[model samples]
Target chain A: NSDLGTWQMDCTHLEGKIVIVAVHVASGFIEAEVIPQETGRQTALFLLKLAGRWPITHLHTDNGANFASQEVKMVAWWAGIEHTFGEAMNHHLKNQIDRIREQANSVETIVLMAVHCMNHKRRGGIGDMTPAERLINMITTE
Target chain B: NSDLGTWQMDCTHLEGKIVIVAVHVASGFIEAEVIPQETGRQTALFLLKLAGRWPITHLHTDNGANFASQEVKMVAWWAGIEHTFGVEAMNHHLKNQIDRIREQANSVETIVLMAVHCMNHKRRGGIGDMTPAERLINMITTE
Candidate 1:
């Protein structure tokens, strides 16, 4: 699981800010947060938010220094999550984020709507169940 | 950017063996090869075959020794492809499809190839709703 690579906001209301995205691999769930900057602290904080809903057994990210920071690693260890770096690009995630940003009217609505449409409406991978639906099924089954 | 993780074959002709898969990142087209061992040499051979079909600008894989080998690097260099290592979550759908095909008891090669055929022909959401094959053709034509 990894955040959608850092995104530079292009919306008029939040043009200068960056949004960090976290995803659950098995269920394809996504969580996006607008942060001040891309730092170890921000990445760790996002990981904690991801961990809040699901048991993230493993994390996969690019070999970015932010992902490798002591703070992120410590958080993973504390959460019993194993982190490994790998190639990171999800065209699906990128396309969705771009579309949502263009249509959003405000800062809060964009992130919230992005997560909602992605987790509730999109249903292709994960047995044709929505990401949110799949996550629930997986947790209940296991 | 990544190979579908090595898969254990359950088909009658190659049960207990494994297959290595490589994907064209933008197109989602895939090719699978059966190798006696997961060595750099075998991986390089696979890379060459993939490069034969498409203009690979970048090569991405895990930090496995095989991907880091001199042979793979030379192949990528000779082809003018830049190599990098990273992680991905894109193979879940591919693996899920293959599991269903494996239950059909087809030959190992046929199974992998059929799975590839299905994926390449199916229009995908993220890829402009075009099939991988169509996407690749469009990409090359646009260039």
Candidate 2:
């Protein structure tokens, strides 16, 4: 609370050993490397990068220790972001993040798809904009 | 570690979860509140309960912290169960949970069993060529 830094952190498992973290704003970064699962470091960098990009108020997470450690906590405290945890065992807590992971089929396409698909949604949160809108957006632009 | 007395140390979620673990020998206790740790005490207990009714030589799982913890290790040791982990090449995440859960649901019994009997036969993954049914059959029988 003294450094006067400011940011928020959020993270999720993209797949086996793959993690996705969003610092702030409606966007985030994906961690595909296996070894980076090295506890808080990866989530820390992910949070830092996003914080650099936007203002964050609350840092949130699931059960993974990545969100609870010094690497993230100290930095987040310095930045003045509040930390919160999801209710235990609740899948719906991180709806927006999970929504993006569900849309994925191939790991390679995830980064592109996550940003485009996740942020593109509106009041009709019932389902993703459906892969259709993005598919056709590329065609007939002329 | 202290003997800590012999008792059933069950754990749960914030909603108070209890982990009920089992292997291929039976249909299984629902996925909720159930997780396996390699050297985990809980998984060891779960495995132990079934061993008296059957024979278990190997324990398997992914890289989840549960499998690697000392909790499961001590139990597996005395029981003489060999623990095996899935390799990265296998991409365990997608298919592991997806397929295992699907099979259990379909096999649970139903009018669907009679209804989809024709189509359900090989709906399981046989790997590159093996049929999913026989794969699981061999898995169960072998275990």
Give the TM-score (vs. native) of candidate 2. 0.30
Error of 1 at A8 (Å): 21
Question: CA lDDT of A109 in candidate 1?
Answer: 63
Residue pairs that clash (backbone atoms under 3 angstroms), model 1: A3-A21, A86-B86, A86-B87, A87-B86, A87-B87
- Candidate 2 residue-wise lDDT, B3-107, digit = tens: 111112223321122333232322111111233332354454444433322234455554443456554565456445664322221212222443344433332
Worst-scoring 10-residue span by lDDT in model 1 chain A: A4-13
Q: Quote model 1's iRMS.
A: 9.4
* lDDT tens digits by residue: candidate 1, B25-139: 5455656656666677777777777677666666666645446678878887787666533333334555656777877756766676677777779875341567867766675
Q: State the interface C-alpha RMSD of candidate 2.
A: 24.4
Fnat of the models, one by one?
A: 0.06, 0.00
* Model 2 / residue B31 / CA error / Å: 43
lDDT of 2 by residue, A1-142 (tens): 4111222334445455454543222222121111236466656555543332223456666556566777677657644666766512113223444666654344433433343333334334343432223222211121
